[PDB]
Ligand binder design. Structure first.
Ligand code: HEM
Length: 110
């Protein structure tokens, strides 16, 4: 199977390197990037993201519901366009299929 856990780890490295302030919205605010993998909040959140990717591939993802929850954290289409780029870099680093269509599905509700 594609190692989505590793893809997501590289995704958050790319995301928070480019936009460190986005990290302040999570339970691992303030934690050094090189130690995220040892942080309990981060392990939980990454696992949710992996689950969402597997749901999107599997055909069960609720993009509208995810979008609504992100608006509920004052996260919008600008942030998602940045994430789309970071995720494309992470997928490429692992030879994983690009997830741009899944992110577009979320964007269509933002
Ligand atoms: C590839 C783009 C992204 C995907 C696939 C994604 C996915 C997810 C998922 C699956 C959850 C958990 C939702 C739930 O439990 O129902 C979540 C929560 C969250 N996301 Fe994202 N996300 C993305 C981008 C972003 C960006 C750019 C931000 C900017 C800060 C962000 C901020 C948050 C926050 C603050 C939470 C709540 C975390 C908490 O409960 O402590 N997300 N996201």
């Amino acid at each position: 199977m594609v190692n989505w856990a590793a893809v997501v780890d590289d995704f958050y490295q790319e995301l928070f390197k480019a936009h460190p302030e986005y990290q302040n919205k999570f339970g691992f605010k303030g934690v050094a990037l090189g130690s995220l993998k040892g942080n309990a909040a981060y392990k939980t959140q990454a696992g949710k993201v992996v689950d969402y990717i597997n749901a999107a591939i599997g055909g069960s993802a609720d993009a509208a519901g995810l979008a609504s929850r992100h608006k509920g954290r004052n996260v919008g289409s600008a942030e998602f366009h940045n994430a789309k780029a970071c995720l494309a870099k992470a997928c490429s680093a692992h030879g994983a299929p690009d997830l741009g269509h899944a992110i577009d599905d979320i964007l269509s509700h933002l």
